[PDB]
Every structure is written in C-alpha cells, then in structure tokens.
C-alpha cells in the first residue's frame, strides 16, 4: 500500500520514517493464488516486508538445501504476539499529533500493519513510569475501600487500549502484571529495595494483595476491558536483591507457590474473573526448571497455574535447552509464554540505536528460538519510547521497535519492528507450529506453522553474510524454489490444497 520512507542514522540499516501525513502500510491481507506462494522480505540493505510471489512447482532436482515441511508433526498452538502499554509508551504515543498517534497504533494493531493481538498492562507503576504510585496508597486500607485507578490508567493507558482494540480485526488479549504492592503491605515500607509482603501466605497482608488483583480486574471491567491472563508478580526474584532500584516485590519460589495456593488462586477462582488465566514466574529463564519444580509439584498451587511466563533480556547470554527445554520435558502440559523481551539495557550500550539490523536479528532469532522450545507467544516490552529510550524514573533506558520524536512529530520504525512483524503479522492466534526438516547442515534459522484454516507459514532468518539458495518442500503441495539472502528475513505463506 505505502512503502517505507528510509532514513539512516549511521547504524547498519535504516529506519522507516512516519509522521502526521505518511506511514508505510500494507494492502488488506490476501493469500496468494492456489499453486502460488507469497514472500515478504526484509533486508539489511533496506527492503522492509516487501511482497513478491512465486510458483509452487511440481518438480525439484539438485543437491541444494531442502527444508521439508512436516505438516502432521504438530507442536504448540500459538497464543500470539504483542507488546507492553507502559506509562512511558502511553506518554510517548500521546505526545504525537492525533494523526501520527493513529498511524502508530495502526502500524501495530491493524491488518495494514503487523497484527499484534497481545497487550501487556502493568498494574500501577513500574520503572517505565514518571510517577511512583500504586492503586491503594492510603495506608492500612486492608478492605481496599480507597482502591482506584489514577489518570495514568483512565486518561492514558485505557483510552489507548480501546483505540488499539477498535483498529484490530483479531481478538486482542490483555495480560496484567504488578511490580509492587502498596508499601504498607511490605516488609521494607518502600516501593523499591529488598522487600516482600509482610507475614506469610494465608494472612491479612497476602489476602489483601490477592484482593488487589480482583479490584484491578473489576476496575478495568468497569471500563469494558477484560483480561486473558495475569502474572503472579513481575520479576519476583528482583525484590530479593539488596538495593533493587525500582518497583519490585520479592518472592522465593516457595513464597510464590504458597501465595498462589493459599491466596491468589482461590481469590481469582472465587471471583467473576475466574476465567482469567494465572501465569507464574514472569522472570528470567535461568530460574527454570527449579521454579517450575517448586510451584508445580505442589498440587494445591499447580491446580491454579495455567502457564509459565518468561522474560528475555536479549543483551545477555543464557541457556535455552537446560531451561525452557527441561521445563517442557518435566511439565509438558503447562504452557510456556514469553511475556517481556528487550534490548539496549546495558548501561554502556546506546539505549536506542536507530536502524540497528543486529538488534532486529536479536528479536527474530529470539522469537524463532522461543517457538522451537514450545513457547506459545512473545511479548515485547515498551510499545514506543523516546530517542533516549525513556522516559524512565530511574533512567533505566532501553530500545523499542518504535521511537517517537515529538520535536518533528515523527516516529521511526526500527528493524526490530519488522523482525517482530515477520511473525506477528503472519501467525494468527491458534496457529500450530509444525516440523521443518533440513536436508543438510546450514546457517539459517527457520520455523514453520500451520494456520487454523490449514494454510502454511514459514519464517527464514539468515544472520550470515552469504546468500543461501534453498527449496522448501510441502509434501502435499510441491516445491518453493527461493534464496535466503545474507542478512535477510523472509516470511513465506501459501494455501494447502488437499
């Protein structure tokens, strides 16, 4: 529909520039003709989800790389893809003119954009806030009579979520996560630092905290927003650390187990929100499988836990097989979900690198890795940040797929945006990952899935500098002859005739 307006800021690739009168967009989604495939291509050299079509052929000869679809080898069903409506994201979006706001929200939530279907919503303040607050700051209010949503929710986050929902054709799922409780519930009496709930699971402090989750869901429901899932705490390990700089609430895995079993599970289950799913952990993968073992081997906690939420700090190394792999082996019926990912958080790296192809490749490589380890969805962190990677009240700045520049009423779509979109746009909720077998060793990263309507989607990432000729074989349908260019990402889509 409208192509990328590219701009270089001196990094390895370009951003696409959007403003009050222009943004890149797709035509309404349509599948290629039967016997035809669609290819969407992005490249470091500057192509951004460009559409081409080719024939599916009956015949194939040669000893080049062959990737054979395994459509009957079925793995996880996908929940979807999205990002976080933090206070920082909301402030940045709303600092744009009304037209630019609309083009930014369409970029993410419309079918002429990349089709996000998940929004993560912080329960009150986090580091990506400019004010520290909870919903119940009046002290000793154990019945939560003074629970209320402030303007950060009622004027910023809620209106934007409603606007996203109006643009989306896909059903959108909301996920809620708290960073801190009110300080009068905490051992340290502060939003940050090392501190946990006072007392022990099953007591008034823990019961009040569980009730706060229901009050939050009730309050959002009065604004006609319902949640798909909540997490039991954002990064519960952080609040166990001396000097933790921003909002946190510390739980050991045993504390989380007992809080879920005695307070949060029962309280949610006895509420009008009993259909809301509960995800445990919401933290870094090196805590697995240990945390899952602690919580899920207790039947009283296990009956309340629908899934395990994991965070991806893409700047740092950690094992995937020994964490996600082992967790799936031990608890194959408990879904894994990636609830936060970010890059640029190291103090010594530029928070925002406008046009970084490398950071784009980090996003898509992480998404592929997550899907190959049975994870059902992937959620970015802040939907938009300023050029400093903020605002953030402790200056914990990071990168974002969309960077807003209010002095030009402009926003920039980073390589990260397109790398995420190669998955989000083309993998509807309910898609199922299927097998994809390589005929020979190769440098590509790839994943295949089947849509609910039976159609095929394959994503191929080439992080090498070399162009790799390859063929995709769909045993029911025929052969796709293609190339994976160096420093590219492709998404292939086709209809599958019986």
Ligand X SMILES: c1ccc(CC2CCNCC2)cc1
Ligand Y SMILES: *[C@@H]1O[C@H](CO)[C@@H](O[C@@H]2O[C@H](CO)[C@@H](O[C@@H]3O[C@H](CO)[C@@H](O)[C@H](O)[C@H]3NC(C)=O)[C@H](O)[C@H]2NC(C)=O)[C@H](O)[C@H]1NC(C)=O
Stretch that binds ligand X, among 24-32, 178-186, 192-200, 374-382 (CB under 6 A): 24-32
Q: Does 143 bind ligand NAG (CB under 6 A)?
A: no
Contact 155, 109 (CB under 8 A): no
Kindly list the distances between the CA atom of residue 469 and the CA atoms of 62, 64, 233, 379, 463, in Å, as whole numbers in the listed order. Answer: 11, 7, 46, 32, 14
Residue 420 phi, psi dihedral angles, 5° rounding: -65, -45
**367: its two tokens:** 């998404």
Contact 470, 66 (CB under 8 A): yes
Stretch that binds ligand X, among 4-12, 274-282, 412-420, 477-485 (CB under 6 A): 477-485
Q: Which of residues 14-53 bind ligand Y (CB under 6 A)?
A: 19-22
Cα–Cα distance, 186 to 402 (Å, whole number): 36
Nearer CB in complex with ligand NAG: 143/440:
143
Instruction: Render the burial of 44-78: b for 16+ CB within 10 Å, e for the rest.
Output: beebbbeeeeeebeeeeeeeebbbbbebeeebbeb
Nearer CB in complex with ligand NAG: 267/471:
267
In the complex, minimum distance from the CB of residue 353 to ligand Y, in angstroms, rounded to a whole number: 22
Per-residue contact string for residues 94-113; x = within reach of ligand X by CB under 6 A? -----------------x--
In the complex, minimum distance from the CB of residue 2 to ligand Y, in angstroms, rounded to a whole number: 8
Catalytic residue positions, numbered: 235, 340
Q: Does 426 bind ligand X (CB under 6 A)?
A: yes
Nearest to 334 by CA among 380, 378, 372, 281: 281
Q: What is the DSSP string of 381-432?
A: EES-B-TTS---TT------SEEEEGGGTEEEE-HHHHHHHHHHTT--TT-E
Q: Among all chains, which residue has been given the structure tokens 């402090």?
A: 205
Binding-site member from 19, 22, 25, 29 for ligand X (CB under 6 A): 29
Q: Does 133 bind ligand Y (CB under 6 A)?
A: no
In the complex, minimum distance from the CB of residue 466 to ligand X, in angstroms, rounded to a whole number: 14
Binding-site member from 485, 489, 494, 495 for ligand X (CB under 6 A): 485
Cα–Cα distance, 89 to 95 (Å, whole number): 10
Partner touching 333 among ligand NAG, ligand Y, K ion, none, CB below 5 to 8 Å by kind? none
Binding-site member from 270, 297, 350, 497 for ligand NAG (CB under 6 A): 270
Q: Does 482 bind ligand X (CB under 6 A)?
A: yes
In the complex, minimum distance from the CB of residue 271 to ligand NAG, in angstroms, rounded to a whole number: 7
**Binding region for ligand X (CB under 6 A):** 29-31, 39, 41, 52, 111, 115, 170, 425-426, 428, 482-483, 485, 493
């Amino acid at each position: 529909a409208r192509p990328c307006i590219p701009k270089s800021f001196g990094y390895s690739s370009v951003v696409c520039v959007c403003n009050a009168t222009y943004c890149d967009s797709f035509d309404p989604p349509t599948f290629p003709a039967l016997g035809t495939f669609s290819r969407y291509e992005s490249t470091r050299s500057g192509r951004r989800m460009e559409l081409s079509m080719g024939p599916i052929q009956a015949n194939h000869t040669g000893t080049g790389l062959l990737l054979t679809l395994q459509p009957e080898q079925k793995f996880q069903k996908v929940k979807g893809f999205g990002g976080a409506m933090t206070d920082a994201a909301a402030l940045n979006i709303l600092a744009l003119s009304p037209p630019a706001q609309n083009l930014l929200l369409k970029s993410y939530f419309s079918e002429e954009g990349i089709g996000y279907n998940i929004i993560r919503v912080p329960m009150a303040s986090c580091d990506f806030s400019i004010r520290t607050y909870t919903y119940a700051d009046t002290p000793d209010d154990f019945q939560l009579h003074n629970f209320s949503l402030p303007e950060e929710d009622t004027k910023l986050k809620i209106p934007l979520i409603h606007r996203a929902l109006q643009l989306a054709q896909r059903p959108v799922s909301l996920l809620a996560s708290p960073w801190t409780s009110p300080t009068w519930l905490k051992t340290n009496g502060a939003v940050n630092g090392k501190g946990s709930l006072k007392g022990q699971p099953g007591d008034i402090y823990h019961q009040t905290w569980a009730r706060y989750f229901v009050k939050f869901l009730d309050a959002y429901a009065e604004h006609k927003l319902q949640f798909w899932a909540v997490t039991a705490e954002n990064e519960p390990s952080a609040g166990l650390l001396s000097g933790y700089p921003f909002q946190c609430l510390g739980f050991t895995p045993e504390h989380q187990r007992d809080f879920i079993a005695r307070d949060l599970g029962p309280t949610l289950a006895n509420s009008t929100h009993h259909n809301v799913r509960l995800l445990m952990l919401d933290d870094q993968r090196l805590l697995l499988p240990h945390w899952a073992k602690v919580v899920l081997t207790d039947p009283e906690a296990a009956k309340y836990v629908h899934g395990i939420a994991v965070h991806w700090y893409l700047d740092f190394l950690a094992p995937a097989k020994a964490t996600l792999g082992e967790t799936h082996r031990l608890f194959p019926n408990t879904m894994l979900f990636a609830s936060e990912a970010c890059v640029g958080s190291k103090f010594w790296e530029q928070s925002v690198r406008l046009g970084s192809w490398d950071r784009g490749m980090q996003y898509s490589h992480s998404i592929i890795t997550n899907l190959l380890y049975h994870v059902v969805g992937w959620t970015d962190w802040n939907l938009a940040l300023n050029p400093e990677g903020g605002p953030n009240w402790v200056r914990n700045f990071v990168d974002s797929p969309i960077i807003v520049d209010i002095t030009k009423d402009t926003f920039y779509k980073q390589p990260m945006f397109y790398h995420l979109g190669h998955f989000s746009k083309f993998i509807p909720e309910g898609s199922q990952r299927v097998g994809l077998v390589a005929s020979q060793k190769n440098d590509l990263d790839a994943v295949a899935l089947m849509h609910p309507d039976g159609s095929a989607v394959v994503v191929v990432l080439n992080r090498s500098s070399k162009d790799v000729p390859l063929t995709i074989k769909d045993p029911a349908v025929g052969f796709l002859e293609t190339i994976s260019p160096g420093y590219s990402i492709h998404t292939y889509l086709w209809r599958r005739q019986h």
